[PDB]
Structure formats: structure tokens, C-alpha cells
Amino acid sequence: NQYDNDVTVWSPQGRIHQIEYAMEAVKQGSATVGLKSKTHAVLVALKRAQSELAAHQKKILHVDNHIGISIAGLTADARLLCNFMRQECLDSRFVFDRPLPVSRLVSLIGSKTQIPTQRYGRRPYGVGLLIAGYDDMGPHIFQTCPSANYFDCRAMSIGARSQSARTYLERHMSEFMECNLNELVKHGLRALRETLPAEQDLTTKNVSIGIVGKDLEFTIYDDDDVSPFLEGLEERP
């Protein structure tokens, strides 16, 4: 209706419609799966190429040695949030010489995103972040939706056609905890492959894998590096 223009206007039913639209902004992007085992937090994302002869868009970004993200939403807000998280991680390293906890960084992201959803002047951060990191309490896989609310999830999946990945992760949640790096990556790849249509297949040119573990720093695998993980995946029925 007429309560659909600003984030500072309350609908009669009790909803800030602009926040709902910012949340919808996530589904316009590629599907991303983030999951964590006991010692590893691997997140697999699908990369979309604007043209056949254009490099596939970066989807898994680097924040710090122990904090990785997947961006499913606006490129502008995704990059801004990535830069802010990079600055927060660098500040924590400089002042504390200790890896900034993933939970605290996620809370800071939520606090920073809340302000745009409460004061006129800028639109809500229309990017859904899947934060994966390793800290003293083990792997963490958070999702920071544009509504300024983040959920600590075992294996979340945002973006277009992400419902299939979420259903597969719900089905196979049990095995995730007691799984190695290879099995965790394979389950994440299966979750992503479920999202794709029948024709498309998980090729080495459109899959990005990020892993943070007990003694392994964040690694972003693109192109051939994904090949060792991709090979051996069961052919889709």
C-alpha cells in the first residue's frame, strides 16, 4: 500500500515492509551452502557468469584468517559489509593480537545493519552473509539476513533455489558433525547441486569452496582447486 516507501514507516499489521523487501533481495543471487563439522566449516557457493566468456563472479570473500563469508545479495552491500568486517578483524588483531570471535563479529554486523533499518537515510543492507569461522568454541556458520537478525545455523543455504539445499542439509544434519573435511565438502557440494536445475551440473568453473578448520586457515578454492573435491561426487539420479 502506501506504507511501502520508507524503513521508518510502520504498516498497520505491524511490519516494516522495506525490511521484508531487503530480505527478498537475497533470493536474487546465487545459492550458497554453509555447513560446519566438528573441526571444519566449509561453505560452497554457485558462481554465475554474466556472459559465456566472462569470468564468474566472486561469491566467497576473504575477511580474516578465521572468518569467511558467502555473499548472496546486492554486490554493493555485500562488498561494504565485507570491507567493514575486514576492518573489524584487523582492529581486533591490532588491539588484542587475538582472532576476533566469529560470534562477536556477527553481532557487530547485526548491530551495524540494524541502524539502516531504523533511521531514514539509507536502504537496508540487502546482502545475506554466511559467515564461517573457527575460534576457541569451534566452527561457526552464521547467516546475517538484511533484517538485521542473524541465525547460528549448522548448515544454512540462502539465495535463489536455496530451499532444496536447506532440505538436504536438514535431512543430513546428523552426519555433518562426525565428518571429515572431504565428507563435509562433498555434502555441501551435494546440497548446492540439489539447487541447480536438471540441465546444469556442478562444473569446476562455477563452484567456490571455502574451508576454515582447526589448523587450516581460510582457503577459497576456485577453478581447478575445486577439482579434487568435485571428483568422486555421486552422479545425480
Partner 1 sequence: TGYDLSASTFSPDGRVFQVEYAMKAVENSSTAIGIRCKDGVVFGVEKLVLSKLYEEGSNKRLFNVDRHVGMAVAGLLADARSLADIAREEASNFRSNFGYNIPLKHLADRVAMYVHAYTLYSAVRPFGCSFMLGSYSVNDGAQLYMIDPSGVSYGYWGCAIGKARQAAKTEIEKLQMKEMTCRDIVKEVAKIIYIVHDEVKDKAFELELSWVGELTNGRHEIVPKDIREEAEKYAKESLK
Partner 2 sequence: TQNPMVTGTSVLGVKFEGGVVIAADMLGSYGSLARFRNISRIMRVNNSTMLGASGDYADFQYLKQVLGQMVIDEELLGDGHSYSPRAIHSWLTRAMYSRRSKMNPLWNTMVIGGYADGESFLGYVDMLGVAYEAPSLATGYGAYLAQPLLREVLEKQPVLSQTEARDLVERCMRVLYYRDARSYNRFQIATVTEKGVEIEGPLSTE
Binding site for partner 1 (CB under 8 A): 2-3, 7-16, 107, 110-111, 113-115, 117-121, 147-156, 166, 169-170, 173
Query: How far is CA 9 from its chain centroid?
Result: 29
Burial of 58 (0-12, 13-18, 19+ CB in 10 A): middle
Among residues 15, 104, 119, 214, the one that binds partner 2 under rule CB under 8 A = 104
Nearer to partner 2, 54 or 95 (CB): 95
**Alpha-carbon gap, residue 38 to 197, rounded angstroms:** 31
> Taking a C-beta distance cutoff of 8 angstroms, is the pair 222, 192 a contact?
no
The type of residue at 115 is: I
Place of cell 540487502: 126
To partner 2, the closest distance from the beta carbon of 63 in angstroms equals: 18
Nearer to partner 1, 148 or 209 (CB): 148
With CB cut-offs between 5 and 8 Å by kind, which of partner 1, partner 2, none does residue 96 bind?
Answer: partner 2
By CB under 8 A, is residue 231 in contact with partner 2?
no
For residues 133 to 172, the per-residue mask of contacts with partner 2, x marking binding by CB under 8 A and - elsewhere, is --xxx-----------------------------------
By CB under 8 A, is residue 97 in contact with partner 2?
yes
3-state SS class at 86: helix
With CB cut-offs between 5 and 8 Å by kind, which of partner 1, partner 2, none does residue 24 bind?
Answer: none
Backbone angles phi, psi at 152, to 5 degrees: -80, 105
> Taking a C-beta distance cutoff of 8 angstroms, is the pair 142, 130 a contact?
yes
By CB under 8 A, is residue 96 in contact with partner 2?
yes
Nearer to partner 1, 2 or 50 (CB): 2
> Taking a C-beta distance cutoff of 8 angstroms, is the pair 218, 65 a contact?
yes
Query: How far is CA 231 from its chain centroid?
Result: 24
By CB under 8 A, is residue 215 in contact with partner 2?
no
Q: Interhelix angle for 75-96 vs 102-114, to 10°?
A: 130
3-state SS class at 4: coil
With CB cut-offs between 5 and 8 Å by kind, which of partner 2, partner 1, none does residue 8 bind?
Answer: partner 1
With CB cut-offs between 5 and 8 Å by kind, which of partner 2, partner 1, none does residue 162 bind?
Answer: none
Which residues of this chain interact with partner 2, rule CB under 8 A? Answer: 94-98, 101, 103-104, 107, 135-137
